[PDB]
From a paper:
KRAS is a G-protein that functions as a molecular switch regulating cellular proliferation in growth factor signaling pathways. Mutations in KRAS impair the cycling of KRAS between its GTP-bound active state and GDP-bound inactive state, leading to dysregulated cellular growth and oncogenesis. The switch-II pocket is a shallow pocket between the effector protein-engaging switch-II loop of KRAS (residues A59–Y64), the α2-helix (S65–T74), and the α3-helix (N86–K104).
To further benchmark the performance of FlexCovDock, we collected ten co-crystal structures of structurally diverse ligands demonstrating conformationally diverse switch-II pocket poses. This conformational flexibility results in markedly different ligand–receptor interactions in differing X-ray structures. Ligand–receptor interactions can differ substantially between different copies of the same binding site within a single crystallographic unit cell.
Numbering used by the authors: -1 to 168
Write the structure that this text describes.
Amino acid sequence: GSMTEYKLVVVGACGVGKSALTIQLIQNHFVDEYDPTIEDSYRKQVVIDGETSLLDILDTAGQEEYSAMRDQYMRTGEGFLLVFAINNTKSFEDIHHYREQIKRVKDSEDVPMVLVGNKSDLPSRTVDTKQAQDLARSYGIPFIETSAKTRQGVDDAFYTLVREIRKHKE
Ligand SMILES: *CCC(=O)N1CCN2Cc3cc(C#C)c(-c4c(O)cccc4Cl)c(F)c3OC[C@H]2C1
Ligand SMILES: Nc1nc2c(ncn2[C@@H]2O[C@H](COP(=O)(O)OP(=O)(O)O)[C@@H](O)[C@H]2O)c(=O)[nH]1
Ligand SMILES: [Mg+2]
């Protein structure tokens, strides 16, 4: 029957859990060693607020920043997940650079994004919840705490981005 296809892109520094968040959503698996240069897309059909949704998720990786292939996925991308790790201060600081780069390639100021603080299962936190929420408010986007290990917030992160895209359409 009726459904909506959503083109999603996951971006963030090395080792934050981009690949782990994608594989956890798609096949309920926590991957320990996913090759950091492997940049693949994964499809998943899910019901979100009683609407059938076809998620198409690009997991960015260690490849050239400005190849025709990445430009194509960035230009077609409808929503962005801005991922940092809550035990990695530099990955959180880097969120500023990624948001502006997304705005620049999308040539717009209203691009649907969600801020995702991943590895929420780790005690050795260095980015407190308040700091992340401050950053999220400064950009007018929601913030979701997630763990690819425990599955906490994984569904919520992707489903919230879908809701953000819905708002942007109307
Ligand atoms: C460990 C390797 C890995 O997972 N990577 C490599 C580093 N990369 C950083 C990154 C940088 C930029 C930039 C500039 C973008 C990007 C590009 O290339 C074009 C348009 C918009 C944006 Cl945000 C990017 F997507 C990434 O992805 C994260 C990360 C992945
Ligand atoms: N404890 C914990 N480890 C994680 C989590 N997400 C990813 N990792 C680990 O961090 C490492 C880097 O993950 P990966 O998904 O490859 O990061 P990427 O470079 O952003 O794609 C891997 O060993 C993962 O098992 C998480 O939520 N909790
Ligand atoms: Mg990866």
